[PDB]
């Protein structure tokens, strides 16, 4: 919930899960990724689409 208001993110697309429900279930081995990309291909980085 703290990651929802402090930084107004341009895009927030929670795939395969409901964004609000992430608080009440225990996952396994969370992985984080980071890089820099142009503004147009942010929609391009999505599952399935080329």
């Amino acid at each position: 919930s703290v990651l929802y208001n402090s930084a107004s993110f341009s895009t927030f697309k929670c795939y395969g899960v409901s964004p609000t429900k992430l608080n009440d279930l225990c996952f396994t081995n969370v992985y984080a990724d980071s890089f820099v990309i142009r503004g147009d291909e942010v929609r391009q980085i999505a599952p399935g689409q080329t």
């Binding site: 599952p47 399935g48 689409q49 080329t50």
Partner: protein
């Protein structure tokens, strides 16, 4: 003969050839077409009774 002839219907897809759909469009969309053909052919098989 009717069961054999049933293998040439779309059942609601863009075509009725698996190779055509596979080679004409990407998987993440062709999955629904393959689902439609598979459901139709399962019904055709279950209609054994």
């Amino acid at each position: 003969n009717t069961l054999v002839k049933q293998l040439s219907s779309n059942f609601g897809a863009i075509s009725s050839v698996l190779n055509d759909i596979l080679s004409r469009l990407d998987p993440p969309e062709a999955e629904v077409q393959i689902d439609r053909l598979i459901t139709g052919r399962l019904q055709s098989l279950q209609t054994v009774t």
